[model samples]
Structure formats: structure tokens, C-alpha cells
Target chain A: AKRNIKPFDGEKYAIWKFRIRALLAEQDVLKVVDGLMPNEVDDSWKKAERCAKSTIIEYLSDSFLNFATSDITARQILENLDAVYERKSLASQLALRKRLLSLKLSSEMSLLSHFHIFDELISELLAAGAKIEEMDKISHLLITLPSCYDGIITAIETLSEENLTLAFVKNRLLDQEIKIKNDH
Target chain B: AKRNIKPFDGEKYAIWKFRIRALLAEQDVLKVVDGLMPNEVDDSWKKAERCAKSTIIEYLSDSFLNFATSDITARQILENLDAVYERKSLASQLALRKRLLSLKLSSEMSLLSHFHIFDELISELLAAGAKIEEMDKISHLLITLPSCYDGIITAIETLSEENLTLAFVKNRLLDQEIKIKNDH
Candidate 1:
């Protein structure tokens, strides 16, 4: 079966970059894109460079097509895209925090999925240079869960600040989720 | 500390809806938005309804501001947003599939986060009515993992198809991740 490379549409730039790099590696043209070779004029090097640049152009979505000009090499195309989309700005950090703070469980939604999202947001926020304290993280998670989870929340409330770690709360939440699901 | 409700930004409609509903519930105005009151004209009902509507308005971004017109009730505003963003179309299904297929692990990235994203994408695809076979899911994951994971991949390749489950693979990958981290 043929493998597919997803066209990037201006979201998750890091993930897209990783996929593109991997694809170029798989095609034996990553060295061309990375500018690892000493000479750029050799026949084999030119062939590899063309393959790499074509793959880059092929995977770009319509919105990003402006960066696919024929004059640029694969590395140049990637750098141009990076210049536009790569941002570790406070705005993105705050947006992530807002999403995490606003997170809540609806009756039909699964707790596991919600917890995964919580894990993702916290990781992303930390990576973006946000200083989220351990207690704040635990409280943010505990506060947003619905009334159906109040039993576990009440149980967790008995723990002292030293013992109330995010990991501990996560285990309790997960166990509660399993128990709740089994009951249904 | 004051709680924040994220302004919805035309994505993750289900999660946004869940948060909005929970916020309304917390404010004791969910019933007002749900039209549970016998008479809308009653002072208490009117007060709650207005509170519910204003909360909805307060949590909407500029793009969704048009839905917050004074004439409509809180439920109407939600319904309007839902109509625009609540799509489980084939286009979305294909996009999710493409993203999943294109997912790759880079050296700097954690396996856990990548797995969590894989889990999130699969769940979203399934929720959108995509029917993926078990083997296809397992293989898709294995094929997309980078060369650093080849040791585990080789070990897993020895197992029979019936014995090779997603959970089993996940445990191995996590164990390997820990081992690799310790080595560094």
C-alpha cells in the first residue's frame, strides 16, 4: 500500500515539520534538504534535491502554496514556512491556558479523552514557557470536572497539600472513570 | 482566584459546548437556558435567562459575536453556533485519517505525547463515524513510528497477529521510552 503525506493547513507546525523531515528521510533525500552534502552541483545531489523539494511542494496546502516558489531549495522553503508559523508567543500560551481552564466534562463525553486533552494542554503550555505550579495544575483539573465526579473530588479533598500531587489525582480520576463506566 | 471561560474560536465545538453548559449549570442558570421554566415572563426566570444569555455572550469570540444578538435566547445562540460548526462530514473524516497517517515521531518529542495525540485522533475519527479495523489501527501506528523504535518494532513483529494488540504495543513502547530516557 502507498503511504500518504498530509497537506499542512497552518496548524501544528512542529508536527508537520517532523512528518515532512521523516518523509524526506524515507525517500533518501533528507540530506539534500538538510544541506549535508559538500557539493550541490553533482548529478546525484541534484536528483536528490529535486526529489526533496517536490515532496515539500506536494505536501503544502493551498494556503501555504505561496512558499513553494521554484527558485527556492527544499531547506529555503521550509525556513520560509517556519518564519511565518513558528511562534512561542504569550498569546499562544494564554490561548492554551484558556482552553485548559475552560475544559469541562459533558455527560456523553469520556473521562479518558478529557484527561488526555488535559495532559496535552499542560504539556504544550509548559513547552511554551508558561510556569504552571503543580498545585495549580491539580486544582485546574479537579475544579473543571462535573458534579458526577464530585464523589472522587470529595475523596481527593481529604489529602494534604504535600500528598495532593497531579499524578495522584490522575490515578484517582482514572479509577473513578473506570468504575463509573462499569456501572453503566 | 476568578475562573475563566474560554471564548470559543470556531473549533472544538463539542468541547466548547460542554464548557458552556457546565458554566451555566454552575451559575444556576442552566434550566433557564434549557427552557425548563413554566413561564419566561416571571421575574426570577427572566433574571436567570438574562444571566444565562449574557454568560453565553461573554464567552464568545468576535467571530461568533453576531450570534449574541439581544433578541435571541441563550439556547438560540448555542443552536446557531452548533449549526455552523457541528459537522461529522466525510471531509472531516478524511482529514482526520490523513493526519493520523502522516503522524511521525521526532527525536526531541516524547512518545507519550505522540501516543496521546494518536489516541485523540482515533477517537475523534471513530466519533465522526469512521470504521477502522483493529489490524489497520495497529499497523498504522507501527509503520509511522521512527527508526529509534525499530528494536521494539522488531520484537513485536515476532508475535502472532492475534497476540499483537494495541494495548500490548503501547506498554512495550512506554517501557522502551523509559529505558531510552534512562540511557541518556
Candidate 2:
């Protein structure tokens, strides 16, 4: 079905940045995720898992939210999950998720794809019952798993384009991915 | 006597980049100094010196000219001069004082000052007799001593205002100045 898509609005993007900052400040990312994901998933365990995975991807891909983690920078993105995810309450979660999804549809799609690797890492954290808040203090060890695979895919995808060096492609894909996922 | 000053025109300021580029390409830069500062030296003797000095500065500040050098950029003032000076056979003795004066009066002071550094660098190189146009090929070395010093001073002055650590600031300032002076 042809979905009605709204044009990207820069003013709204700025609002999203502000909301993400507020969510981080409150240490309530999980609550935000729970609020944003489909209620169908809230009722069903498997659906909840899938929804959590998708939401994690959406959060990580977001430009502002991505900035919160060291993994998705111009530098290497760390892949371990145990080191990445931490805790937060529900109130801040809904606010952050609403702000993010309200962004332009194109931007939303781009962000979702960019951080797809984070979905699995976030899932593992949720399953392990890892509880903590404050996104800044989260370590690479927790978040490294998704970064490893996703970083590799991102590197290869980038390298397939012209004017890029093989070594750069290798570093982004192989070295970074291996660094995070070698233990598993 | 206090001269009546006019409001600086940003649009005109934008044009200076083009003018300066064309002027450099056509006439030897020494002519500009001779036109600006005629009493101290004669055109014939200083022409070769001026050319060398201007050439050096051009080489050093090559990066800043990215817009001018791009494949399909609008003709800058210097680009126009390239043809004018070459055809006139006054490449070694053409002066741009009137143009510079106009630029000083109309353009942004910062931009004018930046271009002036190129002119000054060539003047210094001429005074120093740093090098000469060489062998199998007919490429000229351009340098401007005054401009180089001014560029350094301006850069340092700007850097000094920021609250950077002393070592980092010193290193960065030196690196940036050298880069500007030796871009090519």
C-alpha cells in the first residue's frame, strides 16, 4: 500500500535532538522503547522480541541517538552488546521514541537501516535482564556485538562504491567486525 | 586626513576572490606591489622578484582556492587576468593596485586581508631573491613575504582567543599556518 509520507522538516529534527538529550538525561531509554513499540508485541512474547529488535535498530540509526554511542562515529564502531546497553525508566522512553518516529519518513528509513546491527545486541541485553540507566556510561562490551556485524556490512556496502580504498573498506568491515564478534 | 569610509559590501567582497585569482594568473604579482608601493623600487628590477614571491604564495595557499580551481567554477578576477596579462605580454609587470584599493574599500575586511597576504608574500619573496623561474620548463615561483607574515599573525591572533590547552593551541596554530603557507 502506498503510505502517505510527509516531507522532512528540519525544525522537527532539532526537536528530536532535544528529546533524545532529555531521554539520556533521565536514564529511561527502555521505557521509551516499550512505549513506542506495537502493543501487539506487548501482548505476545515473540512479537515483543521482534518489536524490541526493530525499535533498537530504529534508535541506533537515528543521527542524534547514534551520536550518543561511540560506535557509529567516523571512527570504528565497537560491536559488543554487554558493554553497550544500560537502563532507564518508561516515561522518558515514550517521549524519545515519539520524537524520533516523527522525523521525515526518508530519514526514518535511513536511520533504521544504519543501526540494524544494534537490534540483536539490545535484544541480548533485554534477555539477560541487564539493568542500568544513563546511556553515556554504557560500555562497548555491552554494545559491541551489533556494532561488529553491522559495522562490517556498512563497510562492505561503502567499499562497493567508487573512489574508496580497499584498506579502508577492510578496516570498516573485517577488522571492526572481528574485533567485536571474535569471542562468539 | 580622515578618509570617508563606506559600508562594506558582502557581494563585492565575494567578487574579490575571483578578481584576485584572475590577477594572479595574468600578471606577475610583483606588478601589484609596484603599483601599491611604487616609490621604493622600479618595475623592471622588481618584476622577476615579485613574480617569484607571488608564485610561492599561490603554491602555498592552493587549497583555499578550491572554488577557483574547481572544474566549472565561475571566472574569478585572477582567472580573467590570466588571459589579459598573457595577451598583453605584461605578465611580469602588470599591477592590480586599483583593484586592490577597490577591494579594500568594498569587500569584507577579513577576506581582503586574506588576499592581501598573497600579495604581501610575493613582495617578501622578491625582496629575499628566494629563487628563480627555472629550466626545461617555464614555470614561475610565486611568493609574497608581507602577506605570509600577515597570514601568520592573523592566524595566531585568532587562535590565541580560544581556551585551548597551551600545547595543543601552539601546535595547532603552527600546523595550520604552515599548511596555509605550503598547501601545494
Candidate 3:
């Protein structure tokens, strides 16, 4: 199935140009994101981290546009895979995690009504799948993810201006290991 | 000059009604002030301190409007006074402080172009009655205000988020003292 269509080498070149465009696009996007994520995350990855996040969002937008242009089967395949990943893959998991983080950050920052695109992205993820149960699980995770971070350090850091409580930080590490266990 | 105007028994009632109407008018004006302030300040005020600042700004707007709308002599007096203060009054001083703060906060938050109204407001202030020397003072302050943590924190708390810093809280108290000094 993967062999029928060649991956566009032009896509990489396109992305190189797009990277510059994204850099320009990011100038404005960063302003919006800065308000959403005001505190420094580690200084080491600050520039790269912004570029990476911007690139990821840019990639998603580009892919969605491409998928829009593709024939039904290819689009369906991409959609279905996204749906499956939404249920099972680390990338989808991370995307949802980022969404939750964005929501918490935006709420803390009092930037309401700006996440409509994000919500639409999530809806698209749900609609792309065949496994109803898997979709439900993903939906359940989306709904409850915020509460699950209640005693977590990243959660605290992401939400409040204050330093995270030591206990919460410790518990967050424990929860990470527990999640690893549950995954295995 | 003060005694020439008739002092009616209904003066208090008229003043009271005017205050109410002024407050209402000011509410409409704060939408303008919000446009003039930092985005974070605007957001925070809208979210957390909107009512408070809205009332205060509204009052100031009403006072300015009323002062401008009075008889020709009163209007001329205020126009001249605003001009002189643009060079020397406490209100003008605060406006200058706010302008500096707005520039700093906007740069740090990467919101430099989001508040064009504020830029216009500053220009209007300078043109109101400011002599070239006083205008230079205002312009110098506008050029040099550091995009510091205090301004950023206050803006974030008021418009976007509620992550108050200890230094910001302390400076807020100091700001009150400055206000008192200005009033006196």
C-alpha cells in the first residue's frame, strides 16, 4: 500500500521553503503562543522548541491540505491511520497532551475562544477511525486528561506562575512510571 | 471665575446623574482604553480586573469628555491645562508611565503592533499641550522603558493569566504610593 505512491522529495524542498515561510508565519504565531505559554520552559530548547512546535503545526496544516487534495482511498487511509494513532500512537498521544497543555495555558492566560482550530483538529481525529471503541477510549482520555494532571509538576508549572510543590513533582514522576507500566 | 456659574439646588442631583451617565460613558470608553493598553493588561482587565479598571478608565474618560464639553472658557481652560500637563500634570505623568509600560510590555509579549490605538493616544497626548521640551521627556520615557518582569507580570495577571510575582505585588503597592503623591 505504501509503495504505490512515491513520497514527494519535493515535499522536503517545499518544506525548506515552507520553513522560511513558517519562520515568517511563526513571528506572528509566536506572539499568540507567548501569551499562551509565558514562562520559560528550559532555556536550552527554547528556540528549537518553538521552531519544532511551529514546524509540527505547520506540517499538520500542510498534510491536511494535501490530504484534502488526494483521492478518497489515500485520504481515507491517512485519515484512518490518524484515527488509529489517535487511539494508539505516541504522536497522537503527544498531540493530545499538547492540546491539554495548550488549554491549561490558555485558560491560565485568560485567552478564551482561540482554540477552535485545535478542537476541530480533535474532531477530525475522531471522525477518521473505524474502531468505535478505540475512538471512545481516545475521547475519554481527552476529557479526563486535565484532571489526571492534578498533582503533577508539569501541570502546576504549566498552569500557575509559582514553582511546583515538591510533592507534586515527585508524584508526577511516579505517575509517569505508572503510565509506562500501564502501557506495557 | 469659579463663582460666575450658577449654583443651583439641583446641582448635586445633576452631578449625581452625570456621574452615573459618566460611568456608563466610561464603560464604552474603556473598550477604547483596552485597545490602548497592553494586550495582556487588556485581557486581564477583561477577565479579572475588567470591572475595576473599566470603572476607573471610564471615570477618567468621562471627566476628560466633560471637561472638553463644557462652556468655551472651560473647554479652553482644560485644553490649555491638558497641554500644560502633557508637559507637567500627575495625570499626564501617569499617562506617560502607562505609555512606557505599554511599549515595554508589548515588546516583551511580542505584541508591538497589536495596540495601534495606544500609539495614537500617546501622539494625541503629546500634541494636546506639550511643549517641545516636555514632549521630549515623554518621548524619552517612551523610548527607554524596560520590558521588565513587573510590567509583564501585571499585564499577564490582568489580561491573560494570573501568575503574580512577589516583586510585582510589591511594586503594585509602591505604585499606589506614587498615585497618592501624584494626587496630592
Candidate 4:
């Protein structure tokens, strides 16, 4: 279960992070990543840090979360990374923008799930205070639809005078997905 | 603010979907969002319903909220001044609790950012009756860290309950985080 999740270099940070956290939780060792007990100057502490670093090191990619500082424990390595990534809203903002730009339907996923993921991305962007335009949201929602959804996409676009909104797009696609399920 | 909302037990579907949210939101009891419509026969449903009226949820009568939905009444809406706080707050309490359990740390986020989010989560949980054991809350905090903190988490876990204070873990993590920042 731990190995199933690859270290995150960038994409899908939310999902990937949740998986990584869950793994540590399963192992009963999460404080290691959270930079717990920075000061203990003792063996049990070092052992825990050592054990944690080794256990967690499995999922992290090269030079990614590894602080790479001289003789740093995985505890320090992780603490350093958390510190680095912490509150770097600029990076998250950029990442959110990248996600919005790259949003698309995947062949393997259901439209409902896809739509919700899109919804969540929009939400995460909003929560992080990224100002996204309504039209951009609507356009992305439309443009991101797979080729198979071209017909409905065209229908909504043709009625552009109606200003087909993100909500509209969501409702329209949701209806289609629900119909697709029944059709099967 | 008055919309016709039907009971949650699927007793009224059209009205339930359309009106429940608005009614609950208006009444400030929207926290019971999902199971507002429940089999109340199910313990999960009853537990959810217990998050009902203020008398049931608030100060002394708080135990009453545990009654079955069959016993719960729409007439009870907004009956208590504090219930306004209780009914609405409980769902959020549920939500915050749910979020806390799942609030795993992310690489893209800084420890400071994670701390703020978790702190707020805990604060709200406390305001929302933080029924989750304090020990459990601490454990959850430890567990929510990314895979990187196993050692620290274990060190804390391995200690006798008396040795590990939430502040101790927090101070340790914060100091290390400060080190990382200073390093940068």
C-alpha cells in the first residue's frame, strides 16, 4: 500500500499527499514527516527518526524531499522539506494554474468523478485565494471534455448567448454521465 | 429564507434535495448534510441525528440529540438560540472531524501552513465539541503528518502518556521547522 504511491514531484499534490500521509498512518509513524521533536538529543529519538527516515525514504523520490544536507536524518530531511513546502502559496498558486490549464478528461475515469475532480481543483484554487475567472472555469470545463463529449460541448457553445456557466456545464455533463450509466 | 423543505428520511425527495440545503443553511443546521436523509434505524443515522436540535445538542439537554430521527422533529428547528449554534455547528463539527481524520500532510504545503490548517481544524473541533479524545486528536495530528515523520511519531507513541504533551510535540516540530527556515 505504501509503495503503490510514488513520491510527488509535482502533479496531483492533494491526492498524492493524502496517500503518503495515509501510509505513514498505517505504519503508525506520522510525526517523522511532520518534523516532530526537533530537540531530543537522545537514542530513542534518534532511533525513531532513523527508523522513520528509512521507512519513509522508500516513497520519496531522489533529491525531492531529501534535504540532502550533510548527515541529516530522514527526520531532518523531512522536516526541512515540510518547512520548504510550507506556506509556499506561490508555488501552490502556480501549481493550481498548471492544473487548471492541464485539466482534461481521462479515458479511464468516469465523467462524474472527472467533474468532481475538476470541481475540487476549482475549489482548491479558490481556497488558496487564486482568482479564477468564471468564464475561464466554464471554458475549461467545456474544453477539457473528451472528444466523445464533443456533441454536447457543441450544443452548449452554440448557445453561448446563454453564457453557459460552470454550473451549467457541470449539470449538463452530470446528466450525460447519469444517462450513460443507465444506457449501459 | 423560507423554502419548503421536507423531512430527510427520503420522505420528500424533490423537496429534500432542493430545499433541505437552503433550509438547513438558513437555519444554520446544514451540518447534517448527507444523512439528514437516513435510515435512522441505522446507528450511524441515529448518531448523525443526535447532532440534531440544540436542546439535544446544546448544554444540558445535549444528550437528547441522540434520539432517533423518527423521534426528532422539524418543529424543533431554531427552537433554541444556541441550537442555531449547535445544530449548524455540529455538522461542521462532523465535517471538521472528518477533515481532521483525513487532513494528511502534503509536500506542496509548508509545515507552517499545515500547522495553521491543523490548528484551525482542532480549534473548530473544540468549538464544535471536539468529542474525539484529546489523545486521539494528538494521535491524529501525528498520523496526519506525511510519511516523513515515522520516527518522531513513534518516539511520541512509545512514550508513556505522561511524557508526551501536545505542546512538547508541537514545540519540537516548530523548532525544527524554524531550523529549516533558518537554513534556507
Comparing 1 and 3 on TM-score, the stronger one: 1
**lDDT tens string, model 4, B1-184?**
2323323331222233345445445644565643345443576444334433322222112112222222344334333222322223444566567668888877678887887788777765664555666677678778788655666667677864675667788776777566656876
TM-score of chain B of 1: 0.77
lDDT of 3 by residue, B1-184 (tens): 1111122222222222223322323233323322344545556445433453333234343444443343333224333434543344557756755765555423333222322333444444544444434334334433443434345334434653433332223234333333334455
Candidate closest to the true structure, highest lDDT: 1
Candidate 4 residues lying further than 4 Å off, grouped into runs, are: A8-16, A35-44, A63-66, A82-110, A113-172, A176-184, B1-184
- The candidates' interface RMSDs, in order, read 20.8, 23.0, 27.7, 18.6
List, residue by residue over A14-93, the lDDT tens digit for candidate 1. Answer: 66788889878887888876656584378778777766765665566533444553368778888766544543446557
Report, for every candidate in turn, its global Cα lDDT versus the true structure.
0.72, 0.34, 0.37, 0.57
* lDDT winner between candidates 3 and 4: 4
Error of model 3, residue A7, in angstroms: 48
Task: Write down the C-alpha DockQ for each prediction.
Answer: 0.01, 0.01, 0.01, 0.01
Query: What docking tier does model 4 reach?
Result: incorrect
Q: Which runs in model 3 stand beyond 4 Å of their true positions? A: A1-184, B1-77, B86-184
Give model 2's TM-score for chain A to 2 decimal places: 0.17
Lowest lDDT 10-mer window, candidate 3 chain A?
A1-10
TM-score, cand. 1: 0.44
The reply for model 2, stretches above 4 Å from the true place, is: A1-184, B1-34, B37-184
Error of 3 at B50 (Å): 27
Give me candidate 1's interface root-mean-square deviation: 20.8
Query: How well is each residue in A121-146 modelled by candidate 4, as lDDT tens digits?
Result: 77667645567788888876776776
> Could you give me the TM-score of model 2 versus the true structure?
0.17
Who is ahead in TM-score, 1 or 2? Answer: 1
